[PDB]
Amino acid sequence: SSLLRLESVVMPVIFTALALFTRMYKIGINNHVVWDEAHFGKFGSYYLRHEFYHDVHPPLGKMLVGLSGYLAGYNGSWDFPSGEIYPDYLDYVKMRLFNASFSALCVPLAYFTAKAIGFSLPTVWLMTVLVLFENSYSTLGRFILLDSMLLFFTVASFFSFVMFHNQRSKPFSRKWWKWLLITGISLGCTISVKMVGLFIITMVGIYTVIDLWTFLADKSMSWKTYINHWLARIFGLIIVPFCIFLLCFKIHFDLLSHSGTGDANMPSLFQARLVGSDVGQGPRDIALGSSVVSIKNQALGGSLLHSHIQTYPDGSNQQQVTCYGYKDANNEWFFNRERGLPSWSENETDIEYLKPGTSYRLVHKSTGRNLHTHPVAAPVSKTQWEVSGYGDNVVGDNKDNWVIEIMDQRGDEDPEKLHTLTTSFRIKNLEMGCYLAQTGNSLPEWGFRQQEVVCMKNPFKRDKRTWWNIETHENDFQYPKTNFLKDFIHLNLAMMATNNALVPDPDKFDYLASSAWQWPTLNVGLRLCGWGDDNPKYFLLGTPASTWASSVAVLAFMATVVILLIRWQRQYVDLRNPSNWNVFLMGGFYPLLAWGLHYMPFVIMSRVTYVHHYLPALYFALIILAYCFDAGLQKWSRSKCGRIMRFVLYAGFMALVIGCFWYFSPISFGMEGPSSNFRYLNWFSTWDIA
Amino acid sequence: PVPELDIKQGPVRPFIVTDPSAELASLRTMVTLKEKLLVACLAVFTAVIRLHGLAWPDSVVFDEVHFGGFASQYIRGTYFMDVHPPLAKMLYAGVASLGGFQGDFDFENIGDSFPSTTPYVLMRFFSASLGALTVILMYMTLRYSGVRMWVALMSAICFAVENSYVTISRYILLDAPLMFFIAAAVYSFKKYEMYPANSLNAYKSLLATGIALGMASSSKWVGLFTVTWVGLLCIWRLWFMIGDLTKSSKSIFKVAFAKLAFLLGVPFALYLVFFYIHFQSLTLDGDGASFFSPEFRSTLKNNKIPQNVVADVGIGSIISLRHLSTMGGYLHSHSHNYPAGSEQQQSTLYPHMDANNDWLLELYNSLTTFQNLTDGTKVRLFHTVTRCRLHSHDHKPPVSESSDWQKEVSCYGYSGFDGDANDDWVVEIDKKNSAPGVAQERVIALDTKFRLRHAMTGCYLFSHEVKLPAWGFEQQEVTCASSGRHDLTLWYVENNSNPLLPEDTKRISYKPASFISKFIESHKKMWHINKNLVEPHVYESQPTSWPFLLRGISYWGENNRNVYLLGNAIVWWAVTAFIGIFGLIVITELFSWQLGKPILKDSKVVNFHVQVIHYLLGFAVHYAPSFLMQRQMFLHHYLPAYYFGILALGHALDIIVSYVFRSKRQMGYAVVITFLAASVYFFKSFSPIIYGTPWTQELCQKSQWLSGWDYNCNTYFSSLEEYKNQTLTKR
């Protein structure tokens, strides 16, 4: 009618205004850096100085922190430490205003989300005051974080997901392609803010699979229409959210182009491309004798060629040649002429340029032995022989002959000769016939815990382990552009490797870390700043009205899919009309699947997990709680006493999350007291809140 | 042999009834004389094959030293610690002592010839006899699963011929009792399948499924995966019983609750009984209980655990601290220096009692008083032997050097001449992990569990499970860590004595090992060793290379003979080829089903897909958890899943004979006689790798089909004739 249009217009701006008030009330009060504003504020400061860095998370959240830096009048000059006050030129209130504006847009998007997943009108208001009045969302909204951004693109992913579901009756329409593309863009932004945005794309993806599964059942759907459904779902659900991801690494790689911290995680050609460039040399590449080099392995895990002064205790008693991964003067090497020819002298006139395909002897500078493989087997790998250094220019054998073999040339010069950083060369023995290889594993402690060097009989040229390049040259030129897909793959594999380095040791008590079963039932919270009586001190836990009742709604619905499934097998017909089945499927079932996909990896994985990882997984849980008010009280709408009891149960629980949000409000609104004034909201132990 | 489906009409869709007739029970059991004659012939053939040439490897074989030596530990009674549950080691102890075995032979290392005092051929006979009964249980399991008589005959003959079970069952190994009780669990549960779930026969089959299922679970922890397999099978059967409308709801809850009682309460009951016979028979104390708590060891006989120590401890008492969480713990300090840091006197966790574990509690500031150790008392630990304090200068740790936390603690000081504030240790009693009373207030020996906070660094006294190789071998590390784990920070005091206390002092001793604490503590050591079992065994295999039979494991090499585990490959590759073909054909039946074409019309195809989902699920639940294990594992961990694979391939030969060659069953029997004949040919060719009998080298080179498996192929002679003129060495 006309009143429902009035509520449908003026009510989203009441919830919007309460989101602007709930997330921006004490933004500029703390005046100190907090939980991960120290990290992500620094990462946003890296984009303003255009300096390269490395981080676990995909860059769209950090590029939006940098976008808030451009919108805050800030040039990135101040790194963000922990605990310290802000300088006067950095206006942190604009950035906290920016991300609290993202959560302040996460609330009305939950209003229209609940307006989309069926939900007779009191359930939309309960779900909107349920996402709205929460101290966890309004705590992590308050800061320079990409947890608010991950929450916003997760809620936008589910909103455009149901707004894609609602035009399932009219496929290939303007609304169908519209919300399919908006679904793809929001999903790709959900990955590119943080990698645990894969989880929603599992859920949506499972939905997509079910659609294609049930599109086999349509006898009226032709094969042309069905293959068009496949092309539409792979375009707007695979091609688009991966193209947004690639575009975020295009703005990431093409935006920052200087040197910074974490620059050593890249191949040295990409490090040579950027403006800092502490790994390159201008005029010359390499020559004979006088060119002192340090040779790097291009494989993931390979390092510099090291030769320390000790000898082998296992073998023919020659010098140990291994691979070490830091700067050292003992990593220096140079080339010399082969066996039978007179070697290099320091008073030569012809600066000879090296020729590939010709044998040379790699002589170390600070020690002075020949690079060699000797007929004693390698210690760890018993298949191949062992690499050592022996003698000098006149003492050795015929097995010291190592050729230089061209694999790839990175243009802009003569590709026939050996070069620095533009020559992936293999080193092959002449008499034996083995390629110089590296296993990448660890050695025992006789060789000071360094890399294993082998020489395989028959490897293939498609292996990255035998490729070597010159990194440092010692006695007008711009390095070419690297491939963007290769920098994409190597930087993502470096992100995965830093995720492998994030596993904690069990001997150390991480005071900040938590387990996933503690995030429902509120066993522990999270302490986000310094707990002195001066600063306002903030705390992370949900309102125990929303996520206790939401947690028992998840446990009360996960044991309702089973009951309706048993009664389905017992020939009951539960959900007759497509309306209540639509509210079950989109309002109840897929938030249970998205709850499990956003929550169960955090209880399965062996990684450091915190309370702020539960903020997307709570959201779908809250939707389930709205469904536990929607279908659970739907039968009461026919009797007038059931109507009045239903509206006072909606208004009773909504008022209960008003009162329980407002009671626990200073842990999101600030706690300006001396931390002993706030023991009244210290209900349990392990809530280290006072 | 298999009946037609009995589907009825529900109010919405047709439902299948799940009450089998008595005719279904009569067609699948030994009701005739020809079937009993073929079980007799299969038991004669299996009893020849699985038991041939026994005691010809008259030395110990791979992991016969372990479970044989542990059987010797049960006969001697001295306590040992092993990964595995007791029943299939204590069972070799009962088979040993029933044959006249009195310990006396430590099963040391592979190659030790048996003296004429140890019964091994009777233990080998027990292992190979259970490995010969699992063949007959595969025949009867398969026939109970709904299967032609002759195809189960030829498939079970094809299972007695499988090489990996003759190798794994012939020797003193855990997988032949394990595989017997797993085969008895699928046996008794398929016997439960064919009964109408209300009669007394079905509850006898649930009772045998319970005692065999938990007698598999108490032999090795892959039997818990058979508990999981039977459990998912029961979710299947309760799903179809809910689908059945002629069954009342009270009957479905009765089958579900009696199924829950016989299938979890009986495995847990038999598991607790078998650990009670474990803890009841293994009474003595040896070096095997080196890493248990002193209350655990307090139940064992012939103890060196200190009993009746002085409870109330004062300042001036010569005490000995002991680390709670790490089992090898005492505060230890002897005159040998570090190679790094300050190179002072080292502080270690030495697990045994010495005089160097003694520490005076002296005040920071000797009187005639007895000042108690209250909560918050800063003291100094004065080592009485080497004349030194406990000192926590901020230098590099010895072996945990990559630590921004974990400050290093050492020993340096002069009594009365060099006493500073950097030797102070505030005692902070943890009031949760200590027992309440006086010990929760002040320090009591064996009863409180305090934490030593260093007073001038704010860091606590810490230790963990990393030893020190520099000096003081097999001794751990003492540090002073901030934000170290609260479990690893707890210390408690024992073996205290001071002259400022009367002789009639209230002594204290340890709680003596309650069974639940014995049980849970023992299982924490089970899971702790089983989780942290990383060793370089060159015959270690990979779980994703098991279903292709490349690079099998080696067993024994002596006197120009060798024993090597490599399964029957022409059966192995048809098991896993049938995993691929059945997965592909059930994908094409789902796509072909929903695309519009009808599937599952003939009842033999329905029972085929039902039982191969049942056995493919046994292949899944016994092999998929072997990927989520961060430990070492070999080819004999695939083998409980491989039993379900040869069950499923049994049904594959049944769908070759029974459905796709209905008009011409001579060609189905031709396919099964070529598969069986090729299997028995693979056994007859690879018989001298199982029993440790003579091959020749010119055939040992030819037999290696894949280059993956390699078993010291130059060990054999040039011909068999040289084996008759041979004397053999005995280690």
Ligand SMILES: CCCCC/C=C\C/C=C\CCCCCCCC(=O)O[C@H](COC(=O)CCCCCCCCCCCCCCC)COP(=O)([O-])OCC[N+](C)(C)C
């Ligand atoms: C403070 C908040 C706490 C959270 C709420 C807690 C519990 C309530 C949860 C669910 C209420 C039911 C809403 C979903 C059911 C939709 C299906 C439906 O409604 O259909 C129901 C059938 O389903 C059922 O009876 C079975 C579901 C009952 C499950 C509730 C008990 C589960 C266990 C609870 C334990 C809780 C604690 C556990 C953890 C400690 C009737 O079919 P019909 O033909 O009339 O369908 C309408 C068709 N016409 C329109 C033609 C009439």
Ligand SMILES: CCCCC/C=C\C/C=C\CCCCCCCC(=O)O[C@H](COC(=O)CCCCCCCCCCCCCCC)COP(=O)([O-])OCC[N+](C)(C)C
């Ligand atoms: C995948 C892992 C799954 C793990 C969980 C597995 C099982 C537990 C699931 C549910 C347990 C409660 C089931 C209540 C269903 C009510 C249906 C109903 O109310 O309808 C009942 C049917 O009774 C049933 O069939 C219930 C079967 C019992 C299910 C199996 C027993 C549970 C096993 C215990 C496991 C532990 C449980 C606790 C775990 C937290 C009334 O039917 P009727 O014959 O009177 O009317 C005829 C229908 N006309 C009118 C249309 C014709």
Ligand SMILES: CCCCC/C=C\C/C=C\CCCCCCCC(=O)O[C@H](COC(=O)CCCCCCCCCCCCCCC)COP(=O)([O-])OCC[N+](C)(C)C
């Ligand atoms: C019929 C439906 C009834 C239900 C049964 C369902 C499935 C039964 C099949 C397999 C049991 C599940 C076990 C794997 C589950 C976890 C997946 C996993 O993870 O393993 C997968 C694949 O491994 C497998 O090759 C599974 C082998 C299954 C047996 C053979 C299947 C057929 C293939 C041969 C077909 C031959 C051609 C046919 C025509 C002749 C990878 O392993 P990964 O990630 O550890 O590798 C990474 C290792 N790093 C971490 C160290 C790097």
Ligand SMILES: C=C(C)CCCC(=C)CCCC(=C)CCCC(=C)CCCC(=C)CCCC(=C)CCCC(=C)CCC[C@@H](C)CCOP(=O)(O)O
């Ligand atoms: C619903 C009903 C009506 C009735 C109920 C139905 C039912 C019977 C069950 C309801 C259905 C159900 C799902 C149950 C849960 C299963 C249950 C009881 C318990 C969980 C069992 C588990 C899967 C896991 C936890 C336990 C572990 C300690 C597992 C550690 C694994 C191992 C590391 C094994 C190592 C052994 C070997 C591999 C290596 C050594 O090899 P070597 O010899 O040294 O080389």
Ligand SMILES: *[C@@H]1O[C@H](CO)[C@@H](O)[C@H](O)[C@H]1NC(C)=O
């Ligand atoms: C960045 O802004 C601050 C604000 O005072 C200024 O001091 C600094 O010089 C600026 N740096 C650059 C590189 O513009």
Ligand SMILES: *[C@@H]1O[C@H](CO)[C@@H](O)[C@H](O)[C@H]1NC(C)=O
């Ligand atoms: C030390 O405290 C305990 C705690 O009750 C008390 O029993 C004991 O008498 C005290 N020591 C002295 C010397 O009073």
